[PDB]
Amino acid sequence: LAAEFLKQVKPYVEEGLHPQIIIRAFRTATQLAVNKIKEIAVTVKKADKVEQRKLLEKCAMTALSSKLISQQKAFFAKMVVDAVMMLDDLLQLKMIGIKKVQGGALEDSQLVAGVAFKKTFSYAGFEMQPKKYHNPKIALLNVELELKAEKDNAEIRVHTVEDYQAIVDAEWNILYDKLEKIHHSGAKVVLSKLPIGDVATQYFADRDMFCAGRVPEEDLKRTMMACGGSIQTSVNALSADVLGRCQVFEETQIGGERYNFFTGCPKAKTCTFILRGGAEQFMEETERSLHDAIMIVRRAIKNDSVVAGGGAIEMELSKYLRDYSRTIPGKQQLLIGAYAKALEII
Amino acid sequence: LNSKWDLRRLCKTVGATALPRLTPPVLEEMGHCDSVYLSEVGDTQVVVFKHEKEDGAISTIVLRGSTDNLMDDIERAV
């Protein structure tokens, strides 16, 4: 539109017209055009045969069918509409992450009513502990779990050898105390932004708790918003209230990568896309297309206003503006005509 | 992450004195605002201090439109 407006105007610019006349005509025409669009806007909640989502579904239908996934629109529209329906009412994109899993046909790309990780990290026992938890409780630790690894820096002085023994014992008692708080909490799944001590992993393995460390913060926020639990930094103040719960927890291979699953939370306002695809470039392109879809459907939910596609809007504006041009005599008429002639480009 | 000028602005807005000592949330020099929340404009996280002040407040103008260069021009003119 921008380029074609300029293109149609340029021949008149060959004539020595002061640009301000042109821009005045442009402003007037645009204001009139916007008013016309708003007049011929279409709502549906006045109508009878609309489901609160059908407009959204068809909106995704329309917007999608130009990008790289066009032949899977009947599928992706359903996923994205159902997903964004969960976003209420924060409406912000940061909640639902996008997960570019390598490999697989994008027809196999997954929508999970929960949170997953493309990440983990290998410590000693991470493969030892059971990796199924049917009805688990989610504990969310920001604080690290390791032997004063990066806690407050302190020099210590000890005369009696036995006191030195007691000192090392007391450090390990710190970590054991934290772990006991974790277990006696009754949860079985622990996630941490900060790294996890191997020994704590061993204890979780022995007592059949699952754990993981170094989880990226954004996905942790997703998780806590999902299972309803609140992230914790003080292990001591722990109580069942801040403990997230999920319908079922898992961690299953997809394309060689080690992922983590927990989903089915009935009250979860944030989901995530596992996006299969054989091309790394598909990952970015599909992600861009999906981002467009999500943000446009968000706008649609915000504003129950729809118009026809396929350039029909532009044609209607062209006709309306051209007819209006007859009314105003003088130099403005030609500029309005050029406005319409550029506008018809779509 | 507010800069010194920024917190000065906020100080003037709520009329509450910034406190270098973390402890004393003193009643008299403590903030008072009509409404504060977070909103989305232009895919930009925005913190809003929406206010009503009879005694007088330092208000702000929100500039909306496509081209940031036009923002520079228009804000310069304003």
Partner: peptide, 29 residues
């Protein structure tokens, strides 16, 4: 959604305004 086309037209209009409102350009090394 109407918003897409509405914002499109507004942006294009002011783009034309901006571009056409320029007569000359100055470059500095």
């Amino acid at each position: 959604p109407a918003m897409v086309r509405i914002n499109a037209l507004t942006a294009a209009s002011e783009a034309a305004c901006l571009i056409v409102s320029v007569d000359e350009t100055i470059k500095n090394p």
